Amino acid sequence: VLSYHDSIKDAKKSVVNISTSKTITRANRPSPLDDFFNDPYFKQFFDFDFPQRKGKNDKEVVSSLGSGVIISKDGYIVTNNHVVDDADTITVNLPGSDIEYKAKLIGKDPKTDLAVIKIEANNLSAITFTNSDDLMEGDVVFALGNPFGVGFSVTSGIISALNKDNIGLNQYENFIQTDASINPGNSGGALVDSRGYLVGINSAILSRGGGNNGIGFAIPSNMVKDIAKKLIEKGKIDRGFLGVTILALQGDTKKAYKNQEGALITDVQKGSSADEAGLKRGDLVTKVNNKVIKSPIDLKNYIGTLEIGQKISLSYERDGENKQASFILKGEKENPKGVQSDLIDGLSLRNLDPRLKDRLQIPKDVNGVLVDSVKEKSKGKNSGFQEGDIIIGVGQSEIKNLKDLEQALKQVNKKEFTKVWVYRNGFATLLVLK
Amino acid sequence: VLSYHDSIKDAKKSVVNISTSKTITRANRPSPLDDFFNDPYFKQFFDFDFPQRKGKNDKEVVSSLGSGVIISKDGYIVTNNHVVDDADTITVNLPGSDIEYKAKLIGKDPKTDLAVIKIEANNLSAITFTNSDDLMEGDVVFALGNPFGVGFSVTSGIISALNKDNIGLNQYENFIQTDASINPGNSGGALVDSRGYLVGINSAILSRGGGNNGIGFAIPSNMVKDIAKKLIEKGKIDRGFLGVTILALQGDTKKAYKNQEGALITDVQKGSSADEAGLKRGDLVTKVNNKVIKSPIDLKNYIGTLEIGQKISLSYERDGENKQASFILKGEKENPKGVQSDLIDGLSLRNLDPRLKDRLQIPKDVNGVLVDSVKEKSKGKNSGFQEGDIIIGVGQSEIKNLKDLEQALKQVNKKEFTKVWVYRNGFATLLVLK
Amino acid sequence: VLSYHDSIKDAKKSVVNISTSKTITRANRPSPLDDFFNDPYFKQFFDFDFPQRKGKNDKEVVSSLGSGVIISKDGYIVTNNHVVDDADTITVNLPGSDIEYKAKLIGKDPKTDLAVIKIEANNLSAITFTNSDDLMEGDVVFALGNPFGVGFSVTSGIISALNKDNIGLNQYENFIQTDASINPGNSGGALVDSRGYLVGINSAILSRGGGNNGIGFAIPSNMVKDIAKKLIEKGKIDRGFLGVTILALQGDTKKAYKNQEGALITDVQKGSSADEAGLKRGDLVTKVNNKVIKSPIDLKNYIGTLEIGQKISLSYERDGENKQASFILKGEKENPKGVQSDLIDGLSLRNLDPRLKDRLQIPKDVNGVLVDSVKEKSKGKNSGFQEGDIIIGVGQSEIKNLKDLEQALKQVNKKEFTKVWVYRNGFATLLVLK
């Protein structure tokens, strides 16, 4: 007979079930979903009244169930922090040895949502940690933990997606997808490859009944490697940022922003390291000295893997022109004021109640800002806006003064183009600014 | 590592994702269901507030999200018709080249629910369009497209049921069925064999919330291959009929109707191409010039795949002889009228309120139709019916006259046997009319 | 092509579909859930309005729908009891033969919820009954029958859990699990190995949507093998017991109760075949002559595969010493009463309201039981309990007299340690009795 138990024999020696007595399970508390209340038996079941009364799965209310992986022979375990929030007596149960000591939280971060914990025994297994990004889609894998109280279990699968954020279960995310039947209680148990080496970790699943419908998510194993090291070596993680807001370059933005390529600065968050290194609006982020940028979630989760105060000679372009300049890693809590202008670009413009005829007898249609002149480079002249125009609406939405221009012009480096409405000598026309 | 990415590889460049901008998304409007309503975040998620705001999945109410297949190098895409119903500005994402043109809707048919659509670029992919019906159950397949908007993501699995109607997603059906995980947004997307060739087109799934639960359905490629052609040729498909209600031959119906075999005409829609070809009731449809019949979904779907005014020399049998005249392909809209028979054949029956003693003083029990003669070949004569009985009942249901008699004696060829109740020279028997 | 249709050929030849017609479907009536209602179509769909009307799958209100297996060439089929509860006119549709007879129920046992039924024809197949316990996690299998009324469909998978109770669908349980997708109506249908031999029988599935979401459940084929012989033999099965209460030995029980290894008797159910074989409380059950015990679910389900009145020369131990004596298979309804001592072991206690100064005026903290002596072996003197104490409560719970004392000192053999509350000359201590 062919079986792939052969992974399953050793994989349990690393992948723990977790017993988790906590006086406060208030982070891993269910939200007001209309679930199997009114006849709640053993947790995460569905069946009717059956003879085995309470005791088997109950403690999840003033304790928690979960899974973890012992990363090193030092007996340091990893699991998801929602599983280990309020870490009093985080008892474990290792399938393949049945041992039941308290574990000692060494350190956590709720942003990456991850923890490292010393279990107090010796001759504890490590895990062959390998790289989550040698993967292709279609690669075979085994995903592991204790699903919904059955005991320790493993489901055979393939990858069906790579390196996915837009998920934000907490704050920093790069998930990889398998089709494998996995549940909560596999919360912190592993995803290994077909050779039984560590490639990601389970936490959560897109599905309708909490148990799998095709769409299991693992964290990267490379992510947890450096995350665990930072949670060991100071007992937490400490990020800054480049003090920024960011998007990806979109296809129509690209030609409109003169066919440079990288992540779109939306707004540089003033006087942070971005600004001081001379990054601006209409610029694009291209590369960290270790890591390549195209998207907003690239810088976010790369900085979810960098620490305080080190300088970074980051590469960036504007228009057609690259610089590499020197930026301190400066967070949201780290920013001291700065400049940007790129559809207010030599716009000499000012407030009105103008001194000419004739339109009508209401300020509604004539407060805004009047154009003194328009720089040749400004996307306005690309697009047919001229000196002696009057701006009344900016992205269809209307304005009364310079403040409410400069507020909508601070949202333009978030628009491929702008639907301005510009009154002239007599009529208001519609333009398409890029 | 063994990975069947190799299919995945070229199937993205044929199996499209759809930026289906249309202003009336109201033919695929969500049914009034208790889903994740009042607080739905991104469409087709389950989740509580995560850091990423709106801007990734929301457009599906003034657009749609889907998948399709470029069949020939013309760039003739096919997808579901319901994805493109009201087809205004249907623009594309071709996974792996990102080409955001609109496509011309060349034509759509809402009975099969499929449409042919020219994408206005070049070097656009064929697909290797093999037979769905050379498939057996257990054969290995991949399942393709974009599930719930996660982007282009594939699965692989096996066939667990074949060549099926009784699903009624539209008006013409013959789906084949896999375990592999597929959701909404794979709507119109491919099912390819282990070798990478098109054996079917995914349109729906038997699940409990739209994430796959082992039961996904793809239209056979061989039906889409003649659908797409009739829609390339004139922008629509025109289907006929034989003018004939139809069923499968049930098991006692074989032995009652003397051991013929074929699809059971339940009642002829009168004087049609069936009737003028000799097809009556008590008759069984066996074969179209090209296609073999035992059930009514055979004749239905074979007519689905044929167009008007041609003469089909179809074969049928009655009692114990098989005949071969010729039928026009004549619609429900097309049918002159007709002759019927069965359990009234050469019977002589007329109305009553009788002139003999005795019974009772209420008409409920004695109105009906009386029996002058019963033909010897007739089913009544198989089954305990006599001359000088009075029919009161025609299958546990009662009659006041010839009309409600001859109406149930139209429904007797929807029966294996009939429970007539028949008042005799003094008492009401009950009988078994094979 | 590689496909495992090879087993799917001869499996259908024994794995029946059933059209279980009876007037009383009132055991397999739906329970009040928010499953689909007010809008039903065909049973176990989810789908909106389809052009295939009532007639396909209504009947399971006034019939059952299920699966089974023809065991032997004698025509003897095996299925759930709940499928044939009130076996009126149990009609069959064996796939690939269609022989629409009634079957004759030979016998049933609701306890295992298993049947044996004769189908009344000739040349009927068998099934290759192999061992369910030469088995392992991860071996390849197939799961079979009628998944929601479709015909004969088969899925394929790997074993994900072994020999289990705590599922409780009836009264006796030793199920095995695989991921492979099975629905009610596979009720009574099979699980066969990768060579086509019978290893398991699916009854139900711990799903979220009633169709399989990952967690099917097969009673072992070596359990239904002898069950079937006891059902052929006489139409029913006869279960005794050994007239007892049992649990598995907990780890700190192990160490307190002197490091013996078996199933923990919790309370001997008094003058059974246990007590009159010398078996006591705090004695561990090690081996039945044919079946080795470590848990209660052992002895339960071994009784679940054993008949009346035979004498069973069973192994038990006390503290460090093994005995083997003989035990009749005596029911819950078969036991003359009784011998009982454990943390009352030499405890010479009596009722009080006691004649010394001073404490308080309310009886609430001084009614209880006074301790005249404590024998040296008592887990009391292992743990701090002395003579002249006063027991006021036994594991937090307060006692008023000898009767309430002894109710709780009967349940201590359901504990590893007890937190007795014992008043002394002036104060009350809490203790930890092992």
Side-chain angles (χ1 to χ4, degrees), chain C residues 40-56:
Chain C
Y41 290 100
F42 296 159
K43 204 197 161 176
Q44 307 126 307
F45 285 47
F46 88 125
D47 336 61
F48 51 61
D49 188 354
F50 38 85
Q52 287 105 69
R53 60 64 167 169
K54 277 278 186 185
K56 209 187 177 204

Side-chain angles (χ1 to χ4, degrees), chain A residues 1-5 8 42 44-48 50-53 56 148 150 153-154 156 181 209 212-213, chain C residues 137-140 158 160-161 165-170 173 177 194-195 205-208 210 213-214 300 414:
Chain A
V1 171
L2 180 60
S3 179
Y4 310 121
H5 203 244
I8 306 170
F42 289 160
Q44 306 137 315
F45 268 40
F46 120 108
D47 290 338
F48 41 71
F50 57 70
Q52 294 86 358
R53 60 53 159 186
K56 182 176 187 280
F148 288 176
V150 318
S153 280
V154 181
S156 176
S181 198
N212 178 71
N213 307 155
Chain C
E137 179 96 13
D139 310 345
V140 287
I158 45 145
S160 50
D165 193 314
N166 319 293
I167 288 148
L169 284 158
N170 292 112
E173 287 84 15
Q177 184 192 321
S194 61
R195 297 28 185 182
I205 310 82
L206 273 164
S207 278
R208 307 292 101 121
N213 307 122
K300 178 200 163 177
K414 319 189 88 180

Side-chain angles (χ1 to χ4, degrees), chain A residues 386-405:
Chain A
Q386 321 290 332
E387 306 92 307
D389 310 352
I390 295 90
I391 304 180
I392 301 291
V394 184
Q396 305 275 346
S397 48
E398 293 166 39
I399 72 139
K400 86 188 174 174
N401 61 19
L402 272 168
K403 168 56 67 175
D404 289 336
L405 183 76

Side-chain angles (χ1 to χ4, degrees), chain C residues 43-101:
Chain C
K43 204 197 161 176
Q44 307 126 307
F45 285 47
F46 88 125
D47 336 61
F48 51 61
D49 188 354
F50 38 85
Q52 287 105 69
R53 60 64 167 169
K54 277 278 186 185
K56 209 187 177 204
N57 195 16
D58 183 65
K59 52 62 147 182
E60 200 270 330
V61 203
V62 209
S63 187
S64 128
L65 89 83
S67 199
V69 185
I70 311 179
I71 298 309
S72 62
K73 210 93 201 309
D74 338 296
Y76 283 177
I77 78 164
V78 174
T79 180
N80 302 10
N81 164 81
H82 73 236
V83 164
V84 304
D85 228 336
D86 295 333
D88 309 342
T89 311
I90 55 168
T91 309
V92 291
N93 200 306
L94 179 72
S97 50
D98 228 285
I99 65 153
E100 193 99 45
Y101 299 88

